[PDB]
Enzyme design. Structure first.
Site, mmCIF file in Angstrom:
data_model
loop_
_atom_site.group_PDB
_atom_site.id
_atom_site.type_symbol
_atom_site.label_atom_id
_atom_site.label_comp_id
_atom_site.label_asym_id
_atom_site.label_seq_id
_atom_site.Cartn_x
_atom_site.Cartn_y
_atom_site.Cartn_z
ATOM 1 N N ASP C 43 0.834 -1.195 0.000
ATOM 2 C CA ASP C 43 0.000 0.000 0.000
ATOM 3 C C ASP C 43 0.872 1.249 0.000
ATOM 4 O O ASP C 43 1.699 1.443 0.896
ATOM 5 C CB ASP C 43 -0.929 0.001 1.216
ATOM 6 C CG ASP C 43 -2.251 0.711 0.951
ATOM 7 O OD1 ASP C 43 -2.368 1.426 -0.067
ATOM 8 O OD2 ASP C 43 -3.178 0.551 1.772
ATOM 9 N N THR C 76 -4.020 4.555 -3.946
ATOM 10 C CA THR C 76 -3.008 5.588 -3.777
ATOM 11 C C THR C 76 -1.744 5.308 -4.576
ATOM 12 O O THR C 76 -0.982 6.242 -4.850
ATOM 13 C CB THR C 76 -2.648 5.739 -2.298
ATOM 14 O OG1 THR C 76 -2.164 4.490 -1.788
ATOM 15 C CG2 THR C 76 -3.864 6.174 -1.499
ATOM 16 N N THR C 77 -1.504 4.053 -4.959
ATOM 17 C CA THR C 77 -0.309 3.734 -5.732
ATOM 18 C C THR C 77 -0.425 4.260 -7.156
ATOM 19 O O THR C 77 0.522 4.848 -7.690
ATOM 20 C CB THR C 77 -0.072 2.223 -5.734
ATOM 21 O OG1 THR C 77 0.128 1.766 -4.392
ATOM 22 C CG2 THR C 77 1.148 1.875 -6.572
ATOM 23 N N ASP C 377 -7.929 -1.926 5.037
ATOM 24 C CA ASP C 377 -7.991 -1.596 3.618
ATOM 25 C C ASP C 377 -8.999 -2.452 2.861
ATOM 26 O O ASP C 377 -9.455 -2.042 1.789
ATOM 27 C CB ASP C 377 -6.610 -1.753 2.982
ATOM 28 C CG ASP C 377 -5.594 -0.777 3.544
ATOM 29 O OD1 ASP C 377 -5.995 0.328 3.966
ATOM 30 O OD2 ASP C 377 -4.392 -1.117 3.566
HETATM 31 N N1 LIG Z 1 -4.745 -9.191 -10.896
HETATM 32 C C1 LIG Z 1 -5.063 -7.992 -11.456
HETATM 33 N N2 LIG Z 1 -5.099 -7.824 -12.839
HETATM 34 C C2 LIG Z 1 -5.485 -6.606 -13.350
HETATM 35 N N3 LIG Z 1 -5.690 -5.511 -12.591
HETATM 36 C C3 LIG Z 1 -5.632 -5.541 -11.242
HETATM 37 C C4 LIG Z 1 -5.308 -6.813 -10.579
HETATM 38 N N4 LIG Z 1 -5.306 -6.550 -9.260
HETATM 39 C C5 LIG Z 1 -5.613 -5.239 -9.080
HETATM 40 N N5 LIG Z 1 -5.818 -4.641 -10.271
HETATM 41 C C6 LIG Z 1 -6.151 -3.206 -10.476
HETATM 42 O O1 LIG Z 1 -5.165 -2.425 -9.799
HETATM 43 C C7 LIG Z 1 -5.750 -1.278 -9.182
HETATM 44 C C8 LIG Z 1 -5.143 -1.048 -7.799
HETATM 45 O O2 LIG Z 1 -5.503 -2.110 -6.918
HETATM 46 P P1 LIG Z 1 -5.058 -2.118 -5.369
HETATM 47 O O3 LIG Z 1 -3.729 -2.818 -5.227
HETATM 48 O O4 LIG Z 1 -6.240 -2.595 -4.558
HETATM 49 O O5 LIG Z 1 -4.816 -0.564 -5.025
HETATM 50 P P2 LIG Z 1 -3.326 -0.008 -4.775
HETATM 51 O O6 LIG Z 1 -2.538 -0.496 -5.964
HETATM 52 O O7 LIG Z 1 -3.498 1.490 -4.715
HETATM 53 O O8 LIG Z 1 -2.925 -0.638 -3.464
HETATM 54 C C9 LIG Z 1 -7.255 -1.505 -9.148
HETATM 55 O O9 LIG Z 1 -7.919 -0.390 -9.746
HETATM 56 C C10 LIG Z 1 -7.508 -2.783 -9.932
HETATM 57 O O10 LIG Z 1 -8.431 -2.549 -10.999
#
Ligand SMILES: Nc1ncnc2c1ncn2[C@@H]1O[C@H](COP(=O)(O)OP(=O)(O)O)[C@@H](O)[C@H]1O
Ligand SMILES: Nc1ncnc2c1ncn2[C@@H]1O[C@H](COP(=O)(O)OP(=O)(O)O)[C@@H](O)[C@H]1O
Ligand SMILES: Nc1ncnc2c1ncn2[C@@H]1O[C@H](COP(=O)(O)OP(=O)(O)O)[C@@H](O)[C@H]1O
Lengths: 472, 481, 509
Positions: C43, C76-77, C377
């Site tokens: 995160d 947020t990433t 989260d």
């Molecule tokens: N296995 C996956 N394949 C494609 N897209 C993904 C996958 N996992 C997450 N995502 C996409 O990555 C974005 C960020 O997910 P998440 O990790 O929950 O938030 P952050 O990267 O900010 O921690 C989301 O909008 C989601 O659509």
């Protein structure tokens, strides 16, 4: 920063690659208190070797998990993990991603858990025989105190057989260790109950009192206060006065001196007598309960023995003898390693051959599975099999034999279907021998938790790719 | 071991140069000349030829490649890459503490298995069918300027080696240097080029009194006291009444005074190889001197004698309607740059016909031949009793770099396709499921023309392993003479 | 212009750092505290809020993700990834001679156009068990090691469903998050009742009580001060014991007052009694109440007393002289759970607690903190899914469809601002470029297939991480919240507007 973490973990393997096996080397340990020590147990090296590189700290924390549910296989965590990351560079330099390797080892970790039961050669009969324990215990004592496996395999066998009838109560806390300065291993023996080295300071040789207390005319009335409360066994922590020594002998109060604090707190949790700080106050609630307190002379040395004659009895104490305190510490670890060997065998008993036998037999099957299993994860499953081969290489190097001749001959016998074949423990003989006939058998449940931890640690390292400092 | 490891980095760096210079998508290289100039070639043969190297182990890689250029004009890029990749496995030389002799026996043992594995995926060829040979030779015509006249290059390249081959001796020897002398003639275009069915001498015309056009020529092969021998050595030749006097050494100025009096062509500076082709063409005989001539030294059976000035340059055509174990190519072009393109590109195609006619066997190229080999040695290592099995498996993992470069030069995911490329050879037959050099994806070679000859790969793996053996047999550098 | 080049390249380096921890298939980052604490997480809020960065320009971007995590709770990433790419593409035009003011006008037009594009592609699917599992899979998959997905997915979904009825809004304080050691990581499950740290410790206590009336108290049952007009005055140690007889009359007499209430309210068999006093208790009071089938608990938290009022229904009492039956509660199974070392109280199967307990289990400390944040989260991701009835497809499927709307869009305000929309188009497409690398596949080949997917219908196309082909995020169960992308495009444009308009950097102390 992935290549720097892998190279940093290989630095830790060499500190325990050579200390593994019966022909393993010792390590010149220097304590933080300006003391010299020499040993070959990997658990003791890391306790003094402060591993400051955070990449390798995960492997050390995995060895801490090796204390729970098992008391062996620490070198498996250090060698098998180092070989996975060492061969992981060969995949990354080709162009493979770090994520496909993480999911590839989780596939092989489960695949090995299904192949490992098929290699179980024999199992403990659980007949509570001394010949059963000492015959199976010949594997765990060696590589920790080599050469003296004869006496140690029979001593601890006498302590564990006494506790198995008390089913569901066998643990490492029941078998304590008590070592005395002496000649050597020939005078070591096993006794029941709690046994300490300091003899009775007083004149009482035997007393059947129940209450035990743990801590000129005035002091004569205070020692009588210990008798007025119904207690004829007094345990002083530090030194005892000359006038207080004789007052205990008048009313037949057994005086006991315990300088080491481990001896004091051991009584708090067995008989219930807790250490009071004041100068012998009349407090009966904080006193213990013991069936008989007597003095015994075993091995030309008087020793205080707390035998619980009325109770069933489950407290064992091995009386060790040795002229060197440094050498007796190496025996202290082999005793704790043997007690924990059968502590796992209280569960479902399954035994696999040691000496690199299972590590080639387990790799021979996973490698064949990786050849027939397509996908982008086969490159990681293959090296997970070749990573097992480093453990035979650890024993081949410590035995002074070329490891290349070892892996070829271990593969050739298994190619012909001859299972249960391990390394020949001899410097002048690069051949092999059957482990079943020699009596070399490891614990199945230890490898199940060891391969699980070494893979999770290597995955925990590969998941990290950069180190960044912070402040709260 | 420091000398054992020195030959690794000495060759590993040389292979790094031409690692991306493989395939039809070969990457160019920038060579800084000392005068500030830059050469932007891409052929690995000419790149390493000019690069001066300091290590002796790397200098042997250049002497090995030049000998490969004479046998086959292509594939030399992979010769150094395999020899460099085979030696790049330092785990088995030093870390495993093995002797070099341990690994040399392992590679020599693997050499005999690779040879048999390539012959298992072989395929015969019907050389009688010119259309089936067109698919083989087109591998070199593609990505060239000669693609506009591919059918002409096929007729020039395929029929020329048929004239050099002599199948009555059993060995069926083919020599391009003696029997396939390629020459140029100014004027014309690439379409005007043809293969002369005989001998052509590049001797210019010095005197005007010479037989210009004769349909039935006659070829003769071979102050006071000074002109004594000169008039007599010249008068012994006209006893047969020839039309062209072919001499081995140079002719004097006064001896030519009788050659121009006879109004006959005067040829000189002719090799011994060149006269034998003529003696076999018109049935003449090579006499030691002019004074001991006989009746057999005539030109009965010759096609014609023509020294016409074609393209502002004379050319002696002494062709015939026979193939006397020799041939002669007539390259026509409007400029020297166009002539330089067809002259060198046909030599790449002419050498492919040499490999097929000597042994009509092909192999599936485009990364298909390597995976067919590497899959055979991997399964054989699990049942090979001995410590040599470990380096035996390194050859199975090292020969995968040839398709690795073709997919990496294309830019596609080499890790995803190469791992799946193993499954195609594991389950299905190994003679198919190759790699497309232009596209990058997998395709079968039976449908494409990526088939290479057998002699090209045999000399490759023999010289690729022999190079690693010669470099690992070294353990110290001796300085002195 | 040089004042921007220091800020432009500062974000480009920050882009290459945090791009390798987007998604589940990406890598993790380590946090070296220097005191002995080590932490792993993906995160970006923790990689920026608790982490110390060398550059001051990058330190301002850290405060953006800090507030972004407080509103939406995720994403947020990728917020910093778009920011780093917005200034990357803006630098391509700044080299030609464009002022940053016009580029901000282009982002303002595309931000309002893209926000209108979310209103078209958003899906207002009914909230139920099966749909929220698809959402919670998206939030928790990137916070674990590809094994706790199905384990923790059922937990967060059923946790929020237990505390949502009568159209009541969601509150995060209705969930008590506890942690337990000496156990494995896959044992994380849900606890209907409330878990207490310390419980009853006496041999005469019952191991479990099927039904007990919980009495809430706040009375001190240890050695306290004198409650009448007196004090502690003695002359020796024996005289001091006589004062213990006087002071303990305030403690001992209050133990019997609980016994009188026990025989009064359901004193027969098949019943029970549980005292949940917050203060400490003397062993004589434990032995006196243990024999009567009365379980006496002590050493509870201030917030646990607040939830205990809701579990049983008994009102908090402050003195046993004010004891009455009206402040008595009722609960179901009340027992004690046993761990390897410690033991905890469990009062599950309550009447109307309106407060659930997500009991976390893990063997290590640093691994328990990783799941600690994934719970907060994961709970907040589904919280916005129910409060916001509309959702959007995940898998980066919004970014590839957004690029089609903005390229097919002309500004109706001016011409030169059209290039700012062109930069905002390539800045949003970095997410399918990042995830293509974290998955180990080619960056551009994955972007072609998802962009080339077109049809004569409404087609939602996303990124497949396992194969690399076009994935319809609605068919696989990949969904996000509507407020996430809305706050993404609303936030990322304001920061790019504030930084690009910096003309000069003066050293102000
Ligand atoms: N296995 C996956 N394949 C494609 N897209 C993904 C996958 N996992 C997450 N995502 C996409 O990555 C974005 C960020 O997910 P998440 O990790 O929950 O938030 P952050 O990267 O900010 O921690 C989301 O909008 C989601 O659509
Ligand atoms: N006699 C033996 N022959 C071969 N291998 C042995 C022998 N004794 C111990 N080992 C091996 O050395 C490694 C360490 O053994 P041990 O000391 O029992 O465990 P630990 O080092 O974790 O305490 C184990 O994997 C074990 O298989
Ligand atoms: N059309 C093609 N498709 C795939 N691979 C090809 C193609 N053409 C050539 N190659 C590969 O390129 C390699 C080098 O070919 P070539 O250029 O003739 O030799 P060199 O590179 O040594 O000059 C060969 O091993 C062959 O497998």
């Amino acid at each position: 920063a992935v290549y720097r973490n892998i190279q940093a973990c290989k630095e830790l393997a060499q500190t325990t690659r050579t200390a593994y096996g019966p022909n393993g080397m010792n390590k010149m340990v220097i304590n933080h208190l300006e003391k010299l020590f020499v040993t070959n147990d990997a658990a003791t090296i890391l306790r003094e070797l402060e591993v400051q590189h955070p990449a390798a700290k995960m492997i050390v924390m995995a060895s801490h998990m090796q204390e729970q549910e098992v008391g062996d296989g620490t070198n498996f965590v250090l060698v098998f993990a180092g070989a996975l990351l060492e061969l992981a560079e060969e995949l990354l330099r080709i162009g493979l991603s770090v994520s496909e390797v993480i999911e590839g080892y989780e596939i092989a970790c489960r695949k090995a858990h299904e192949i490992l039961p098929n290699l179980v050669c024999c199992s403990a009969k659980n007949l509570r025989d001394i010949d059963e324990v000492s015959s199976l215990l010949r594997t765990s004592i060696m590589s920790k105190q080599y050469g003296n496996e004869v006496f140690l395999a029979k001593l601890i066998a006498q302590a564990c057989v006494s506790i198995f009838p008390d089913s569901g109560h066998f643990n490492v806390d029941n078998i304590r260790v008590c070592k005395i300065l002496g000649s050597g291993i020939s005078s070591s023996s096993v006794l029941h109950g709690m046994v300490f080295k300091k003899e009775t300071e007083g004149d009482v040789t035997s007393v059947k009192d129940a209450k035990i207390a743990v801590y000129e005319n005035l002091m004569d009335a205070q020692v009588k206060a210990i008798a007025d409360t119904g207690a004829n066994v007094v345990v002083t922590g530090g030194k005892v006065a000359d006038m207080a020594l004789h007052y205990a002998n008048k009313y037949n109060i057994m005086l006991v001196r315990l300088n080491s604090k481990w001896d004091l707190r051991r009584l708090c949790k067995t008989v219930g007598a807790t250490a009071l700080p004041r100068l012998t106050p009349p407090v009966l609630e904080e006193m213990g309960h013991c069936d008989s307190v007597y003095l015994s002379e075993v091995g030309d040395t008087q020793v205080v023995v707390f035998k619980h004659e009325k109770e069933d009895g489950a407290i064992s104490t091995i009386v060790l003898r040795g002229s060197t305190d440094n050498l007796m510490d190496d025996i202290e670890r082999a005793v704790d390693d043997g007690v924990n060997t059968f502590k796992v065998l209280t569960r479902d008993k399954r035994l696999v051959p040691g000496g690199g036998a299972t590590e080639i037999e387990l790799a021979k099957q996973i490698t064949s599975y990786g050849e027939t299993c397509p996908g982008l994860e086969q490159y990681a499953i293959k090296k997970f099999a070749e990573a097992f081969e480093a453990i035979p290489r650890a024993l081949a190097e410590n035995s002074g034999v070329k490891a290349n001749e070892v892996i070829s001959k271990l593969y050739a016998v298994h190619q012909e279907g001859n299972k249960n074949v391990g390394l020949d423990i001899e410097a002048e003989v690069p051949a092999v021998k059957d482990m079943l006939e020699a009596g070399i058998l490891d614990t199945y449940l230890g490898k199940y938790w060891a391969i699980k931890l070494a893979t999770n640690a290597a995955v925990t390292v590969l998941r990290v790719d950069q180190i960044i400092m912070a402040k709260p | 071991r420091k000398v054992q490891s020195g030959n690794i980095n000495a060759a590993k760096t040389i292979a790094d140069i031409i690692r991306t210079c493989l395939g039809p998508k070969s990457m160019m290289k920038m060579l800084l000349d000392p005068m500030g100039g830059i050469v932007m070639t891409n052929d690995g043969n000419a790149i390493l030829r000019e690069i001066q190297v300091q290590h002796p182990a790397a200098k042997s890689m250049i002497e090995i490649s030049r000998t490969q250029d004479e046998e086959v004009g292509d594939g030399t890029t992979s010769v150094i890459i395999l020899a460099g990749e085979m030696l790049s496995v330092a785990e088995h030389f030093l870390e495993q503490q093995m002797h070099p002799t341990v690994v040399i026996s392992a590679y020599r043992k693997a050499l005999d298995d690779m040879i048999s594995t390539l012959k298992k995926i072989s395929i015969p060829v019907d050389i009688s069918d010119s259309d089936m040979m067109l698919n083989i030779i087109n591998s070199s015509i593609t990505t060239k300027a000669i693609s506009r006249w591919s059918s002409l290059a096929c007729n020039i390249a395929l029929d020329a080696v048929k004239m050099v081959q002599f199948e009555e001796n059993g060995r069926k020897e083919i020599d391009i240097k003696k029997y396939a002398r390629v020459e140029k003639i100014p004027g014309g275009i690439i379409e005007d080029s043809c293969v002369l069915r005989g001998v052509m001498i590049n001797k210019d015309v010095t005197h005007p009194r010479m037989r210009r056009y004769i349909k039935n020529p006659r070829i003769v092969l071979l102050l006071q006291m000074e002109e004594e021998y000169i008039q007599q050595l010249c008068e012994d030749i006209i006893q047969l009444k020839p039309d062209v006097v072919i001499t081995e050494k140079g002719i004097s100025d006064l001896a030519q005074h009788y050659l121009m009096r006879a109004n006959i062509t005067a040829i000189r500076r002719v090799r011994k190889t060149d006269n034998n082709r003529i003696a076999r063409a018109c049935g003449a005989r090579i006499v030691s001197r002019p004074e001991e001539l006989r009746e057999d030294d005539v030109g009965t059976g010759a096609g014609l004698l023509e020294i016409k000035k074609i393209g502002d340059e004379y050319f002696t055509f002494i062709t015939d309607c026979k193939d006397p174990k020799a041939c002669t190519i007539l390259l026509r072009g409007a400029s020297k740059e166009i002539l330089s393109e067809v002259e060198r590109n046909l030599q790449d195609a002419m050498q492919v016909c040499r490999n097929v006619l000597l042994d009509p066997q092909l192999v599936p190229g485009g990364g298909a031949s390597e995976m067919a080999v590497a899959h055979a040695l991997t399964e054989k290592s699990k049942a090979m009793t001995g410590v040599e099995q470990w380096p035996y498996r390194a050859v199975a993992q090292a020969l995968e770099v040839i398709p690795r470069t073709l997919i990496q030069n294309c830019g596609a995911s080499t890790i995803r396709l190469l791992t799946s490329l193993r499954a195609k050879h594991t389950q299905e037959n190994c003679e198919t499921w190759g790699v497309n050099g232009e596209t990058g994806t997998l395709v079968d070679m039976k449908e494409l023309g990526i088939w290479e000859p057998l002699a090209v790969k045999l000399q490759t793996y023999k010289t690729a392993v022999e190079t690693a053996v010669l470099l690992l047999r070294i353990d110290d550098i001796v300085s002195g003479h | 212009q040089a004042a921007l080049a220091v800020n432009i390249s500062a974000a480009r380096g920050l882009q290459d750092v945090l791009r390798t921890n987007l998604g589940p298939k990406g890598t993790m980052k380590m946090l070296v505290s220097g005191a002995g604490d080590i932490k792993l997480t993906k995160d970006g809020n923790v990689l920026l809020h608790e982490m110390q960065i060398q550059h001051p320009t990058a330190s301002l971007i850290a405060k953006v993700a800090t507030a972004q995590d407080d509103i939406t709770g995720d994403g947020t990433t990728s917020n910093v990834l778009i920011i780093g790419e917005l200034l990357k593409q803006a630098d391509l035009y700044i080299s030609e001679g464009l002022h940053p003011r016009i580029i901000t006008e282009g982002f303002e037009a595309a931000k309002e156009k893209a926000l209108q594009f979310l209103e078209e592609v958003k899906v207002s699917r009914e909230m139920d068990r099966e749909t929220l599992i698809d959402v919670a899979r998206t939030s928790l998959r990137t916070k674990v090691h590809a094994e706790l997905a199905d384990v923790l997915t059922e937990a967060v979904v059923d946790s929020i469903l237990a505390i949502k009825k009568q159209d009541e809004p969601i509150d995060l304080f209705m969930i008590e998050i506890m942690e337990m050691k000496h156990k494995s990581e896959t044992d994380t499950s849900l606890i209907r009742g409330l878990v207490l740290d310390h419980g009853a410790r006496h041999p005469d206590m019952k191991k479990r009580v099927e039904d007990a009336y919980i009495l809430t108290c706040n009375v001190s049952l240890e050695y306290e001060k004198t409650e009448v007009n007196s004090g502690f005055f003695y002359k020796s140690a024996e005289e001091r014991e006589k004062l213990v007889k006087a002071e303990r009359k305030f403690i001992e007499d209050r133990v019997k007052k609980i016994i009188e209430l026990k025989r009064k309210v359901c004193g027969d068999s098949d019943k029970g009694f549980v005292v949940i006093n917050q203060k400490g208790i003397d062993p004589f009071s434990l032995d006196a109440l243990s024999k009567e089938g009365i379980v006496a608990l002590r050493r509870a938290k201030r917030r646990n007393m607040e939830r205990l009022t809701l579990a049983c229904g008994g009102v908090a009492l402050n003195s046993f002289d004010d004891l009455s039956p009206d402040c008595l509660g009722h609960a179901g199974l009340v027992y004690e759970y046993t761990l390897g070392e410690e033991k905890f109280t469990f009062i599950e199967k309550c009447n109307n607690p309106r407060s659930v307990t997500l009991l976390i289990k893990g063997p290590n400390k640093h691994t328990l903190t990783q799941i600690k944040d994934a719970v907060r989260d994961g709970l907040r991701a589904v919280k916005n899914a129910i409060d916001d009835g509309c959702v959007v497809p995940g898998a980066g499927a919004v970014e590839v469809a957004m690029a089609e709307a903005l390229i097919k869009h002309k500004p109706s305000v001016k011409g030169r601002a059209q290039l700012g929309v062109q930069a905002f188009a390539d800045a949003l497409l970095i997410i399918p470029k990042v995830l293509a690398q974290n998955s180990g596949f080619d960056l551009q080949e994955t972007l072609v297939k998802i962009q080339a997917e077109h049809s004569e219908s409404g087609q939602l196309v996303g990124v497949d991480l396992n194969t690399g082909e076009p994935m319809v995020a609605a068919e696989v169960g990949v969904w996000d919240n509507y407020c996430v992308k809305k706050q993404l495009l609303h936030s990322c444009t304001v920061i790019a507007t504030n930084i690009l308009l910096v003309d000069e950097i003066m050293r102000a102390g």
